[PDB]
Amino acid sequence: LGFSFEFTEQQKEFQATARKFAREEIIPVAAEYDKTGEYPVPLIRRAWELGLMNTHIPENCGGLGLGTFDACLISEELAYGCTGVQTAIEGNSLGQMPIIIAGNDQQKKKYLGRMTEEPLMCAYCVTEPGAGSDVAGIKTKAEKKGDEYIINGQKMWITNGGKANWYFLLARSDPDPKAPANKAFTGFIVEADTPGIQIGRKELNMGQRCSDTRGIVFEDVKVPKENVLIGDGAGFKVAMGAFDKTRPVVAAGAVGLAQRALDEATKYALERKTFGKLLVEHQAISFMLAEMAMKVELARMSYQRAAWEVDSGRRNTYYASIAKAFAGDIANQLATDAVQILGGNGFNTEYPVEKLMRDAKIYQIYEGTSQIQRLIVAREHIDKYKN
Amino acid sequence: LGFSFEFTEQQKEFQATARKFAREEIIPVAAEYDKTGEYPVPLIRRAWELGLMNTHIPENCGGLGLGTFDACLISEELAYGCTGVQTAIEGNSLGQMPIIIAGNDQQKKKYLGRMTEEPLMCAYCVTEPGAGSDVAGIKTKAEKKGDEYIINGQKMWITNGGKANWYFLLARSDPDPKAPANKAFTGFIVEADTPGIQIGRKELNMGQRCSDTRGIVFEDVKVPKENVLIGDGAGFKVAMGAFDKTRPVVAAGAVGLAQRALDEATKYALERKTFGKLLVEHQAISFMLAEMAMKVELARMSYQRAAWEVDSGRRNTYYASIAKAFAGDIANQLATDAVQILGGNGFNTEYPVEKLMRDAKIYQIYEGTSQIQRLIVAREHIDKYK
Amino acid sequence: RFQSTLVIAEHANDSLAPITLNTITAATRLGGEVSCLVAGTKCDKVAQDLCKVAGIAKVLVAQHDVYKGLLPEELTPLILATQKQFNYTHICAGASAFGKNLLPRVAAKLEVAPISDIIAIKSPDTFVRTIYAGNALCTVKCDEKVKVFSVRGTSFDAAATSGGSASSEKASSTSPVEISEWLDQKLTRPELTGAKVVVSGGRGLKSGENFKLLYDLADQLHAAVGASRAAVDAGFVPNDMQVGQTGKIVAPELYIAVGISGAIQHLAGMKDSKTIVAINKDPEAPIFQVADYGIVADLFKVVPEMTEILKKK
Amino acid sequence: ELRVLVAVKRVIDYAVKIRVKPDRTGVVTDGVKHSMNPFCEIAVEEAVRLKEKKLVKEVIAVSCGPAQCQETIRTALAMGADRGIHVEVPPAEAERLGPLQVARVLAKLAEKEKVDLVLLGKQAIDDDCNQTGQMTAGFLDWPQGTFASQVTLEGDKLKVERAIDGGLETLRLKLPAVVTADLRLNEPRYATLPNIMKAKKKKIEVIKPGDLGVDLTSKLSVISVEDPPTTEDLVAKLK
Numbered sequence A: 001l002g003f004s005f006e007f008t009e010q011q012k013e014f015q016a017t018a019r020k021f022a023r024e025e026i027i028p029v030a031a032e033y034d035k036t037g038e039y040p041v042p043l044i045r046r047a048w049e050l051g052l053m054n055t056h057i058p059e060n061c062g063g064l065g066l067g068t069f070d071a072c073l074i075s076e077e078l079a080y081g082c083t084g085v086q087t088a089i090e091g092n093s094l095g096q097m098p099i100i101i102a103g104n105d106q107q108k109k110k111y112l113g114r115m116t117e118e119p120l121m122c123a124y125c126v127t128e129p130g131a132g133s134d135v136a137g138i139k140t141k142a143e144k145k146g147d148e149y150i151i152n153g154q155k156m157w158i159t160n161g162g163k164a165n166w167y168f169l170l171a172r173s174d175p176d177p178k179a180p181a182n183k184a185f186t187g188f189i190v191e192a193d194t195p196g197i198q199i200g201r202k203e204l205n206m207g208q209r210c211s212d213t214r215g216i217v218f219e220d221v222k223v224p225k226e227n228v229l230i231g232d233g234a235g236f237k238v239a240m241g242a243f244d245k246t247r248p249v250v251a252a253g254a255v256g257l258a259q260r261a262l263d264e265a266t267k268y269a270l271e272r273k274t275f276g277k278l279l280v281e282h283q284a285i286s287f288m289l290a291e292m293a294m295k296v297e298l299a300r301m302s303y304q305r306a307a308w309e310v311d312s313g314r315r316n317t318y319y320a321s322i323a324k325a326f327a328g329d330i331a332n333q334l335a336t337d338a339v340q341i342l343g344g345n346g347f348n349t350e351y352p353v354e355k356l357m358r359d360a361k362i363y364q365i366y367e368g369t370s371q372i373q374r375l376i377v378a379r380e381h382i383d384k385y386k387n
Numbered sequence B: 001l002g003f004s005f006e007f008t009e010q011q012k013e014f015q016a017t018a019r020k021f022a023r024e025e026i027i028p029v030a031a032e033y034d035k036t037g038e039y040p041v042p043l044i045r046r047a048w049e050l051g052l053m054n055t056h057i058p059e060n061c062g063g064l065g066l067g068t069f070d071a072c073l074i075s076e077e078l079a080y081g082c083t084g085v086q087t088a089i090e091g092n093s094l095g096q097m098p099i100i101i102a103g104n105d106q107q108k109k110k111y112l113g114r115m116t117e118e119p120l121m122c123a124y125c126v127t128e129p130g131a132g133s134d135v136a137g138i139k140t141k142a143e144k145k146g147d148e149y150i151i152n153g154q155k156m157w158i159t160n161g162g163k164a165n166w167y168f169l170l171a172r173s174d175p176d177p178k179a180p181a182n183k184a185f186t187g188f189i190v191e192a193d194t195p196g197i198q199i200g201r202k203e204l205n206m207g208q209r210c211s212d213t214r215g216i217v218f219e220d221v222k223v224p225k226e227n228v229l230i231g232d233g234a235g236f237k238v239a240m241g242a243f244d245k246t247r248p249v250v251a252a253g254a255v256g257l258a259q260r261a262l263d264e265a266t267k268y269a270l271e272r273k274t275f276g277k278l279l280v281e282h283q284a285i286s287f288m289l290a291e292m293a294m295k296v297e298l299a300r301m302s303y304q305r306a307a308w309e310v311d312s313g314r315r316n317t318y319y320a321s322i323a324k325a326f327a328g329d330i331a332n333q334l335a336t337d338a339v340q341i342l343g344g345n346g347f348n349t350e351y352p353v354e355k356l357m358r359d360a361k362i363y364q365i366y367e368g369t370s371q372i373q374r375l376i377v378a379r380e381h382i383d384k385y386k
Numbered sequence C: 001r002f003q004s005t006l007v008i009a010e011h012a013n014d015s016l017a018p019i020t021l022n023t024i025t026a027a028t029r030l031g032g033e034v035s036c037l038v039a040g041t042k043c044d045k046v047a048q049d050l051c052k053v054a055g056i057a058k059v060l061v062a063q064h065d066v067y068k069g070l071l072p073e074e075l076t077p078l079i080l081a082t083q084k085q086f087n088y089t090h091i092c093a094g095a096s097a098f099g100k101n102l103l104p105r106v107a108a109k110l111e112v113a114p115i116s117d118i119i120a121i122k123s124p125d126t127f128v129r130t131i132y133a134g135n136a137l138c139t140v141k142c143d144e145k146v147k148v149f150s151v152r153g154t155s156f157d158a159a160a161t162s163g164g165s166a167s168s169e170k171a172s173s174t175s176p177v178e179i180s181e182w183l184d185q186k187l188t189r190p191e192l193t194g195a196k197v198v199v200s201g202g203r204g205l206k207s208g209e210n211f212k213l214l215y216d217l218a219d220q221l222h223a224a225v226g227a228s229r230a231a232v233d234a235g236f237v238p239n240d241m242q243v244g245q246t247g248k249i250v251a252p253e254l255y256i257a258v259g260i261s262g263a264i265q266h267l268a269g270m271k272d273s274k275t276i277v278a279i280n281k282d283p284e285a286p287i288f289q290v291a292d293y294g295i296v297a298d299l300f301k302v303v304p305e306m307t308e309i310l311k312k313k
Numbered sequence D: 001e002l003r004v005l006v007a008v009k010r011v012i013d014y015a016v017k018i019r020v021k022p023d024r025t026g027v028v029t030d031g032v033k034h035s036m037n038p039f040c041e042i043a044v045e046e047a048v049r050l051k052e053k054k055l056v057k058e059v060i061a062v063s064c065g066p067a068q069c070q071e072t073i074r075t076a077l078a079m080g081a082d083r084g085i086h087v088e089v090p091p092a093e094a095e096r097l098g099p100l101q102v103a104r105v106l107a108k109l110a111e112k113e114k115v116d117l118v119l120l121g122k123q124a125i126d127d128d129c130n131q132t133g134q135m136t137a138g139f140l141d142w143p144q145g146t147f148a149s150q151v152t153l154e155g156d157k158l159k160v161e162r163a164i165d166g167g168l169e170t171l172r173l174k175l176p177a178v179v180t181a182d183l184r185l186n187e188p189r190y191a192t193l194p195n196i197m198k199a200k201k202k203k204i205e206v207i208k209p210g211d212l213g214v215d216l217t218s219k220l221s222v223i224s225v226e227d228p229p230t231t232e233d234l235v236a237k238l239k
């Protein structure tokens, strides 16, 4: 019993490795990969060699079986080097989570096991061109036909979308539109080299450019029935359960970037002089740095709180959607100010802050937008007060 | 170890007592006390009895000897009920802190001891008509003059100023204007019925109206050399040192009132209807509610953190100024927001939120304004990069 | 105390190590017959030079085959064996790899705490050194029966190579120890980033054929050759040499900026060089702030004049 | 098949930006992040690469100071070191601790644990000494291979390449020996997450200098720790 904001010595050594790899191996090439938009293979394989990926995978599948808290402290470190590469290797926990929380013993040793053996990627495919936020407007259809299902439709904006061995796939099970969302969807494990599957060209976004993102079209795609997650209609619970353990990690990503923004702006502010003084001697700039420091520290704790709640067996929807909304928001505030403090140089493409502004905007959109986070928080909040 | 965000079982006990006091005894009379502004003597005594006051005094002197993290717990619960009330109570820890951290055993047994035996009050005298934020600007003079000093000057805005048994006083003991803060100020304990001490009228502020805040002058007030805190000229180090263990708690005060604002506003949105719908069912109001929740949770953690830092041995200066800065600002945002949700009623004295707004402005001013807090954080932050 | 001092020479290919002259200077501060031990296989060549040197009362000579490659397992009892016969207060050397290797073992044999890399001397029991990659200055009141320490070379001046004349006695003997043996050697214009001595030219050189003057000198300082982005862009040099924000971040011992205005973007690639040189004719040239040393002067007169103060020294 | 003893020092992480005590007695050294002196990393690395080549039965990691030095031994354990030894000195006497006291500790230990080889880093970045290796080697009367860039066993002899001022000299050493790692020697490995966990199992005997038969009292004392401040003049002011 007792509040503690101090890590286990085990977590310290994790953080130290995560951080050695971030400063040493990611940063020195992170602009290079943002420029070419090439998928960062050597780093993903290194991170996998270091044990920094697939961290949730349980021990009985050759995993480490580690907490949400550990992922978060790790991934804050990777993000600090680059959110493009952090997102890439984060895509794995995303695709894996349903299987970890909803898969049977063969499903688990099959699709989780292989991640333990080579460095393969997986992705989570839910979003479609007509629905992202309104997950319950997914229209990718899935029909039972004997010993298997026939998946037809189109998925958009999928991380590792063209780089994945296999997919978590959520699809509309029931044609009845009166069907409750909670029971209307099935979720699958869907190998990527299945016939019918058409991965699209690389999507060119403003930010996190080296991460792989693309549309996928499913036509008449045969999915073996023993890869259904729990049953028919079950998918929606499954997909929603996942977030508890992944939203904290996305938030932890954002602070990574915010911390980077803060350090870059603080170093420059100690070098650049204007009107005969360092920028830090300009009260407005100190005020700025103070506030950035405030926003980072609270953002950090917030994701730390959400990671602890789920790690404690409790569910964390309230705290996690707090962390994502705030982290997302302050990552952006911090990116622009870092640009601003750097000034003309900050707006230029050989300084490292401009990338952060472009990388940052994503955090107010994927993994649940700033608006739908506030509906989630508002709903959990309101419920605490009603009978 | 690991991180933990669970109170200890005994802490929950404190919280339970404090919540029950605040909601069963404070809330019912908090509005009358706001209207009249008379000093809440019953509830103080009552807090004193339940053990929710002078929590910092070590068992040494018959105190309960708790940390800052415990004082924060209780203070948030009291403040949820009323920050006027809860301020008057924290007034005593403000006064105590400089003696707690820097007194000898005589000074502690003497001036902290008595607080144990009865619900006496005490006050912190630093601010002056001419300097508040700028503490090295204080002009109140102390001249050494035998086995005693002579105090001259005027302090201002003193919580419990006219309700106290004794004062932490800080005065300019070096007349050479070139001398540094570090060497120029001496800090004293000063019995209130000492001749010379003239206590002013009650001050009339926007908020926390039941709190006793007033001015006080010193005319040849004599103070024994036995009552100097560490030695001549250690006043600054001492006065400064108090803030680590008080600011976290001021921020929990701010969080309490925030929580109250949000609770009132949420109850009302669940029962008020417009355009055929509960206010809850308008996306705007929902978003407001959610944003307020966020702020509170975050503000609370910020203080919980600062407190733990200081209870853990280390300076919490960077952390405590972040918690003060943010809890204080978001308290003001929450309260005006909570008024907004209640609408016309909100602006009305027969409802509870209008009070919250008037109370909450103070939290951006006393114990170091929002701006000063930010200078501190910038300072702490920046020094970590050279 | 009756306080003699003793400098351990360092030397090779019949030549005294410069850092030894710097150590002899520091020795004289303590006040007391600087005796200096020259050990090795072909000593006297070098022992004759020390005799001409300024401040050297005795030149103790220890010639033995066994000292090939000056191993500190051999020279340690050599040094204790003198110290028994003479009882010095002080025993030191230049803080080179040789000096650094030898002296702490000597300490351990004498059972005294030794002091590394001194840069000043308040007195015979009080020395000043640097710690935390030189981010602090520590000062030490050693109180040992024997003071053992090495000396930062460029913290002191080389005493006159000629000047005083000094007696030279045969040193006391040791028995070959033969738990170590020297085998081999290999000696050495570096790659830019790994280096410890960088020269760089700005736009003020005016052409790439003009960079011959910077090589001229970066063979005297067995040194690396970089440039600004404005020297690269003007066609002078290729891209893999640009020091700065878009180029190779460096921070060696010695950085020479030649004709470099010193824009914040170039300072970002090297303000962490330990030591920074600034030759630039404009006197209000941003580069001066960050340079420990510099001159307001034409580089075509000052630089080829420096390559001629290091052909000899 | 040898037994190796690696000395690892808990130092003030180089990436910290250090700050001098107001009372100028020393630097500020509380709550400040620490780590394993980066030369020690290189030393642990070579102990393990030797092991890997099957030229070493065991590797012990050892550390002298407070109880926080255990984090440092856990890192070495994670890197391949087989088992730890902590030599507890309270933060108090830790402040007035230095290579002499350590060398004594290690000399007593190497002897005690029947080891063939003692690995240290070239120097420690806190005190910038470069003495412990040398000094340990003196107390055991073993040969020392300082500033090593390369190492080989040739039986009951070690071939040691080392970094000297002009370049690289090579040596051969009779083989109870003492070698101090130089920058050039290797690239240290990462504490692999799996192995950070596996290292939490492996053992660490925790003892006192008093036991081994070592004093500690020190006729050194720090007086202070302040802060740092024609071409005919210039080659003079480089010299």
Ligand SMILES: Cc1cc2nc3c(=O)[nH]c(=O)nc-3n(C[C@H](O)[C@H](O)[C@H](O)COP(=O)(O)OP(=O)(O)OC[C@H]3O[C@@H](n4cnc5c(N)ncnc54)[C@H](O)[C@@H]3O)c2cc1C
Pocket: B123, B124, B125, B126, B127, B130, B131, B132, B133, B134, B156, B157, B158, B159, B160, B205, B213, B362, B365, B366, B367, B368, B369, B370, B371, B372, B375
């Ligand atoms: C209800 C109440 C109770 C109080 N109780 C006590 C008490 O019991 N004991 C006690 O000692 N004091 C008490 N005070 C004093 C209180 O802490 C001070 O008001 C506070 O420190 C600010 O000082 P000031 O009022 O003199 O404002 P000023 O210092 O004059 O500040 C004026 C404005 O300028 C800004 N400012 C000042 N300096 C700077 C600068 N450095 N850079 C940028 N901006 C700056 C401030 O943020 C503020 O906005 C109390 C005050 C109130 C209002």
Ligand SMILES: Cc1cc2nc3c(=O)[nH]c(=O)nc-3n(C[C@H](O)[C@H](O)[C@H](O)COP(=O)(O)OP(=O)(O)OC[C@H]3O[C@@H](n4cnc5c(N)ncnc54)[C@H](O)[C@@H]3O)c2cc1C
Pocket: B272, B273, B274, B275, B279, B282, B283, B284, B285, B340, B341, B342, B343, B344, B345, B347
């Ligand atoms: C000093 C004072 C003088 C006044 N004088 C007059 C006057 O002379 N004549 C007169 O007619 N009235 C007067 N009024 C009434 C005043 O105009 C109303 O209070 C005002 O119109 C707001 O309505 P409400 O109080 O009923 O708030 P409510 O309708 O209950 O709304 C409460 C809160 O919910 C919000 N809300 C309500 N519906 C929505 C929605 N659909 N979407 C998003 N948010 C929503 C509101 O904005 C508000 O924040 C006065 C009020 C005051 C305080």
Ligand SMILES: Cc1cc2nc3c(=O)[nH]c(=O)nc-3n(C[C@H](O)[C@H](O)[C@H](O)COP(=O)(O)OP(=O)(O)OC[C@H]3O[C@@H](n4cnc5c(N)ncnc54)[C@H](O)[C@@H]3O)c2cc1C
Pocket: A348, A349, A350, A351, C201, C202, C203, C204, C205, C227, C228, C229, C230, C231, C242, C243, C244, C245, C246, C247, C258, C259, C260, C261, C262, C263, C264, C265, C266, C269, C279, C280, C281, C282, C285, C297, C298, C299, C300
């Ligand atoms: C995004 C961005 C990134 C950049 N990154 C880098 C970077 O990586 N590295 C870099 O170097 N630049 C970089 N720059 C460019 C930088 O801002 C300057 O252009 C550069 O530092 C100036 O180069 P310079 O000193 O060689 O040329 P100049 O600034 O023109 O300097 C010429 C100097 O030579 C002197 N001089 C001329 N003749 C003589 C004489 N014969 N004797 C003595 N002195 C003489 C002059 O007095 C003058 O001060 C970057 C710019 C941008 C916008």
Ligand SMILES: Nc1ncnc2c1ncn2[C@@H]1O[C@H](COP(=O)(O)O)[C@@H](O)[C@H]1O
Pocket: D006, D007, D008, D009, D010, D037, D039, D040, D043, D062, D063, D064, D065, D099, D102, D119, D120, D121, D122, D123, D124, D125, D127, D128, D129, D130, D131, D132, D133
């Ligand atoms: N307290 C210590 N504990 C263990 N090893 C040490 C300690 N101090 C120094 N060493 C070893 O000595 C090497 C250089 O130390 P120094 O001589 O202090 O520069 C380090 O890399 C360590 O291997």
